[PDB]
Amino acid sequence: MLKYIIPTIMLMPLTWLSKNNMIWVNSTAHSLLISFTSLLLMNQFGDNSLNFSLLFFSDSLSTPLLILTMWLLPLMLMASQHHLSKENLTRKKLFITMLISLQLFLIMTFTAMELILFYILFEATLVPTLIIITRWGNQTERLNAGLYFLFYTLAGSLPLLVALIYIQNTVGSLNFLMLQYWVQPVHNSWSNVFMWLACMMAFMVKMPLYGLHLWLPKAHVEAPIAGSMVLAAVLLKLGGYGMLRITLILNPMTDFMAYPFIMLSLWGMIMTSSICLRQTDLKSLIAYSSVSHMALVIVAILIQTPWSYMGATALMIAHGLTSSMLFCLANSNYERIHSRTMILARGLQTLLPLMATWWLLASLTNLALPPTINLIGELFVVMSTFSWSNITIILMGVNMVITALYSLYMLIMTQRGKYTYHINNISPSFTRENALMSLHILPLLLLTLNPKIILGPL
């Protein structure tokens, strides 16, 4: 509520209004504080969900999901600091403003009270993200990532507004989710498929199916300095949750056609992870993880029958961190050596000993050792999706193999002798290198102690 948007918009002139170089520490100081407010009135119910205003129930829903969104902001200025210190302050004042200008809508969205505040705010980004990709790129291939990032996201999300304005005047008012207490079903026709297909395909083009992901590595391979907005674009994607607000209801009873979204993404899950093994560019190698065990949720959501939402929620915020943090490693190791080519960096682990245990705990949580959230987020997937049909144990059982050769080959490539020609790579990871790389593994594993705070209603 205004408890949140108002201070975080109050942030906005906490920055430029300041002096010279004090700016970074000025806003990083406050931006942490809001996290007390983040929990503050939140983590109330529980049962019979919280709605505190007419057009906002901040998050009740058991999709808390908002606490993270308020984390990643003052993880950027620790992240983004590296080469952004080399241009002017009135531009550096900008890049902190639009970056906030993103953070303000992700608080608006995830609440939205309804469908039609979601959408205009579901499309309300792409103004702030697109401007961070095109400027402050690195290569010159960036200019095409500008377009491809649109012309999909916007391409098929217009058929929403044709459909959601079609519901508003058909049955009552969509003004509120919390009233669905009248919903008739959707039986069949050659019209209703389209309705269901229009109210869906806009979401898929964000969390990729194995088709129409053609943009995802185009934008991430070449993308701002620190992953500065690349950490944010790994929040944006998973935020396609809203399919959890719809497909639960609002055409419940068409599962009839589900199968082309099952067998299409269920054989890609065994697939695009395997086209990730021979990659020669590291920020590509991680970008294809992000498809894979993200695209497993799309076979979690379509199937009804909770024990999937038990396991589908834990995944949106499962790689929400692990897949975040890897883009933070591959950034750092790139500061020192200016190729992103994976081969070139070898013979590390002697020269940066403390950063050894940083790779490991990262690459260990794709392996998903049993105790952490990762498996307890996957093993509620397999338990329901087994009951669907027994044969799902094979493919998604293969996923649990190729992903293990997948991860290690990234670490074990950095255990070798190489002294080779590098006179660079002196800096022994000054604190920010290891400070911002923490505040992930500390908060991540921690939740396993009381992991009832990440769960759906079911």
Binding site: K3, I6, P7, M10, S18
Partner: protein, 49 residues
């Protein structure tokens, strides 16, 4: 001067937290429900609304 720039901004909170209290007076319209949910005889429902 006294650095208005600094923590004067957090005061935005209680600024806002008050606004969430502006509405509760116009959302009073139901003191009556069966779920306990009483607003029965007490000087409790009387506060907060």
């Amino acid at each position: 001067r006294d650095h208005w720039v600094h923590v004067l901004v957090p005061m935005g909170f209680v600024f806002g937290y008050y606004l969430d209290r502006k509405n509760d007076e116009k959302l009073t319209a139901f003191r009556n429900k069966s779920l306990l949910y009483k607003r029965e005889l007490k000087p409790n429902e009387e506060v907060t609304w």
